[PDB]
Ligand binder design. Structure first.
Ligand SMILES: O=C(O)[C@H]1CCCC[C@H]1COc1cccc(C(F)(F)F)c1
Length: 134
C-alpha cells in the first residue's frame, strides 16, 4: 500500500462553487466557460509504481495526465492552455502547480470523509469542486 491509495478510483463531480469566476481569472473565454461549466466530469485516478495517472472524461473534453511526484511535465489543459506542471504530496494533499505565460494556478486535491475535494486557486479567486465515488 502507498502514497496515493485513498485517491485511487473512479469519481464523479457532485458540486461546484465559483468555477466561472476561477475560469475568468485564468483567462478562459466566454464560450469555453459556458460549455466547460456545464460539464460533470468523471475523474479516474490510478497508480502504477511511481507513476500516477489522472484521467478526466466529460462531454466537453477528455484529458489525461501521467506524472511522477516532484517531476515537472508538459500538460494540455481542458481549456487548451499549454502549461508546465509539477505535482507534489504535502501532508496528504496532492498539490498541482501550473505555469504558463508568466501566470500560475494551484490545484489541491484531498480526501475529506468519502469525498475527493478539489480546490482551484488563481490569484485571490478559489473554486471548490466536490467529487464522490462513481
Ligand atoms: O474539476 C476538476 O477536477 C478541476 C481540475 C483542475 C481544473 C478545473 C477542474 C476541471 O474542469 C473541467 C471542466 C470541464 C471538463 C473537464 C474535463 F473533463 F475535460 F477534464 C474538466
Amino acid at each position: 500500500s502507498h502514497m496515493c491509495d485513498a485517491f485511487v478510483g473512479t469519481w464523479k463531480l457532485v458540486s461546484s462553487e465559483n468555477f466561472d469566476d476561477y475560469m475568468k481569472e485564468v483567462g478562459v473565454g466566454f464560450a469555453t466557460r459556458k460549455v466547460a461549466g456545464m460539464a460533470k466530469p468523471n475523474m479516474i485516478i490510478s497508480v502504477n509504481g511511481d507513476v500516477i495517472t489522472i484521467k478526466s472524461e466529460s462531454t466537453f473534453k477528455n484529458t489525461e495526465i501521467s506524472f511522477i511526484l516532484g517531476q515537472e511535465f508538459d500538460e494540455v489543459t481542458a481549456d487548451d492552455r499549454k502549461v508546465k506542471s509539477t505535482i507534489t504530496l504535502d501532508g496528504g494533499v496532492l498539490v498541482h502547480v501550473q505555469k504558463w505565460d508568466g501566470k500560475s494556478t494551484t490545484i489541491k486535491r484531498k480526501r475529506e470523509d468519502d469525498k475527493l475535494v478539489v480546490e482551484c486557486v488563481m490569484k485571490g479567486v478559489t473554486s471548490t469542486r466536490v467529487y464522490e465515488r462513481a
